[PDB]
């Protein structure tokens, strides 16, 4: 599935996590009844507190937030495969679009696009529509986020020589491999 999530410095940085937030809620190969509803983008929204995973978007949320970039940059593809099923399985594909570039007058106020209402509450939707039209299942699988750029970002091992990667093989915690990547794109 590829989607677009874009907006703003801030409204990109929240986006990105709401909507990963939100594939691990709607899937969670392994989350638990911690949940949290909160109202954001004009209407209601779901996210797990799981401070392991979190951990993981933490440090990322951190680049995110400031990689080294502020221009291109804003591509991303996440790869989950079932450990227990057929290999492969769900590929969440968002990719990122930074407009009304600028720095000063600045403020802490601008009122995300009405189109990042839909288009976040749409993403949102469509990943939890399917859960429920999904048949409850979870099984091991592996999980691992991509950061793809426009040569405009050249993260070196400040991250961790490719974003760091958890493992899982718990028969509880289902899952079996958690990681993240920063892939470089030309145009």
Do not use: M
């Amino acid at each position: 599935g590829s989607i677009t999530l874009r907006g703003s410095a801030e409204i990109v940085a929240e986006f990105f996590s709401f909507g990963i937030n939100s594939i691990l809620y709607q899937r969670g190969i392994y989350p638990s009844e911690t949940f949290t509803r909160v109202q954001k983008y004009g209407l209601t929204l779901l996210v797990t507190t799981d401070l392991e995973l979190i951990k993981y978007l933490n440090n990322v949320v951190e680049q995110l937030k400031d990689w080294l970039y502020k221009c291109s940059v804003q591509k991303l593809v996440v790869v989950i495969s079932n450990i227990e099923s057929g290999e492969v399985l769900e590929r969440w594909q968002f990719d990122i679009e930074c407009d009304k570039t600028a720095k000063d007058d600045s403020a802490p106020r601008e009122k995300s696009q009405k189109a990042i209402q839909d288009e976040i509450r749409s993403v949102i939707r469509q990943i939890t529509a399917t859960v429920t039209f999904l048949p409850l299942l979870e099984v091991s699988c592996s999980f691992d986020l991509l950061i793809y750029t426009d040569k405009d970002l050249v993260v070196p091992e400040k991250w961790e020589e490719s974003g760091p990667q958890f493992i899982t093989n718990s028969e509880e915690v289902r899952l079996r491999s958690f990681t993240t990547t920063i892939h470089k794109v030309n145009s």
